[PDB]
Amino acid sequence: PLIRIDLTSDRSREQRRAIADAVHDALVEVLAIPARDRFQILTAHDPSDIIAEDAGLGFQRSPSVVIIHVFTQAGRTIETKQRVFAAITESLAPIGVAGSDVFIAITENAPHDWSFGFGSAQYVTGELAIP
Amino acid sequence: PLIRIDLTSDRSREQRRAIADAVHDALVEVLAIPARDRFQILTAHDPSDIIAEDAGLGFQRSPSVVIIHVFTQAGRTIETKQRVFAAITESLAPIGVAGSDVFIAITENAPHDWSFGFGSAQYVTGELAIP
Amino acid sequence: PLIRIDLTSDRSREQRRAIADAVHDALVEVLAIPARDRFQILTAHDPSDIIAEDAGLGFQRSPSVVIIHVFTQAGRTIETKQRVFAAITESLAPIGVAGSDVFIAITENAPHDWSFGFGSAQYVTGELAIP
After folding, report:
1. Which of B35, B40, B118 lies nearest to residue A56, judging by beta carbons?
2. Range of the domain at C34
C-alpha cells in the first residue's frame, strides 16, 4: 500500500517518524503485508492547514490532527478494514496521538495499478506475490 | 468526504482559508452532508510546482491555480456531481478565484473505508448515518 | 489525468520541472492523451519524509526517491499500464532519476468525475472527448 500521512509541523521530526512507524507496524500486523512493503509520504503542515471536525458525532480534536490516507489494492473485507483502523489508532496512542485526532480513509485499486521500481508491474509479472 | 486542496503560496493565508470555507459550504449545500462533516488538507505551493493547462479546450489559466480533489463515498449521481462542480466554482469567484483557475477531481470509495477517529468505522457500526 | 509527483527537496528547480515534463511526455506517448491534458502537482520533502523500501523484492533505493501517483479515468488495459510504467521510468532515466528510485501507483475514476474549470464537467457535456 501507499500511505499519505498529513500531520502538523508542531510535532517533532522524531515523533513524525514514530507515527509513520506506528502506522506501518499496524498494517503489517493486520494485513500481513511484507515487512518491507513500506511506502509512505509524510507531509507536515501548519495546523491551520488541516481542518478536521467531527461530522456531528460530538467531540472536539486538538490542533495536532493526523490524517492517514491508505491507498491499497481491493480485496480486503469490511472487518479487516475495521481491524486496520483500530490497530493504527491503538499503536498511535502511546506516541502522543489521541484517538480524537485520528482520521483514516481508504482508497482502492488493483494489482496491475502498481510499479515498485524499474518500470515494472511486479504483481502482473508475478515477481511479487499478490496478497 | 476528504478534500485535498492544493493551491499556490501567492494567495493570502486569509484567502486560502476562505477558499476552503467556500468549498465546504458548497458541498454542504449540494451534498447535504452534516455541517461538521469537514475534512480538508490545504497545501500551498510555489506556483511552479503546479502545472495545470487546458487539455486543449482553448483557454489560459493564471499561475494561481486551485486544484480540488474530492474523496467521497460512491453513490452520487452524475447530475449531483455537476451541481457540485458548478456550486464550488461559483462560490470561489467572489473570493478571488477565476473560473479558469479551478480544477476539480472526484475519487470514490465505500462507507466502510472511513474512520473518523477513536479507531472505529462509524458508518459500519451505525454511530454515523450513511447517505 | 491528474498526477501527484512527490520527490525530495534536494533536487533543483530545473530538475523538478524536467521530471514533471518527462512524466507528462510519457503519458502523451503511451495514452495518446492531448498534449495539453496536463495536470501535475509537485511536492518536495526532506528525504526522511518519503519512505519507500522494496516490498522484499531485494533491491535498494537512494534517498532521492520519486513517487508518482496517477489519477486517471478507468478504461486503460493492464498491458497499457505496463507500457506506461515503462515509459515513465525510461523517460526519467536521463533526467537523473534511477529506475530503483521510481514508485508508481494508479487510481481510477470516471469521466463524470472531472471538472477542468468554469464549473463544468467537460467529458459529460461533450466539450471534451472521452480519451
Report:
1. B35
2. 1-131
What nine digits make up the cell of B98?
Answer: 477565476
Q: Given an 8 Å threshold on Cβ–Cβ distance, is C53 in contact with A41?
A: no
- The 3-class SS string of chain C reads CEEEEEEECCCCHHHHHHHHHHHHHHHHHHHCCCCCCCEEEEEEECHHHEEECCCCCCCCCCCCCEEEEEEEECCCCHHHHHHHHHHHHHHHHHHCCCHHHEEEEEEEECHHHEECECCECHHHHCCCCCC
Give me the phi and psi of B126, to 5 degrees please: 100, 0
Among all residues of chain B, which has the CA nearest to that of C21? B51
Q: Which residue in A has a C-alpha nearest to residue C106's C-alpha?
A: A113
CATH number at residue C93: 3.30.429.10
> Please, what is the Cα angle at C3 between B54 and C6, to 5 degrees?
135
Q: Is A2 on the interface with B (CB under 8 A)?
A: no
Residue of C nearest to B86 (CA): C119
Contact C80, C89 (CB under 8 A): no
Minimum-distance CB partner of A82 among B33, B38, B124: B124
* CB nearest C113 (choices: B57, B59, B106): B106
Q: Do A55 and B37 touch (CB under 8 A)?
A: yes
User: Resolution to 1 decimal, in Å?
Assistant: 2.0
Q: How many residues does chain A have?
A: 131
* Chain B interface disruption, residue of C13, C23, C28, C113, most B CBs within 10 A: C113
Bridge partners of residue A41, in order along the sequence? A4, C50
B9/C contact by beta carbon, under 8 A:
no
Answer whether C103's CB lies under 8 Å from A1's CB.
no
What Rg do the C-alpha atoms of chain B give, in angstroms?
16
Q: β-strand C66-73 against C102-109: which pairing, if any? A: parallel
Where do we find the cell 473505508? B113
Q: What angle do CA C107, B73, B54 make, to 5 degrees?
A: 50
Longest distance between any two alpha carbons in chain C, whole Å? 48
Structurally, how many domains does chain B consist of? 1
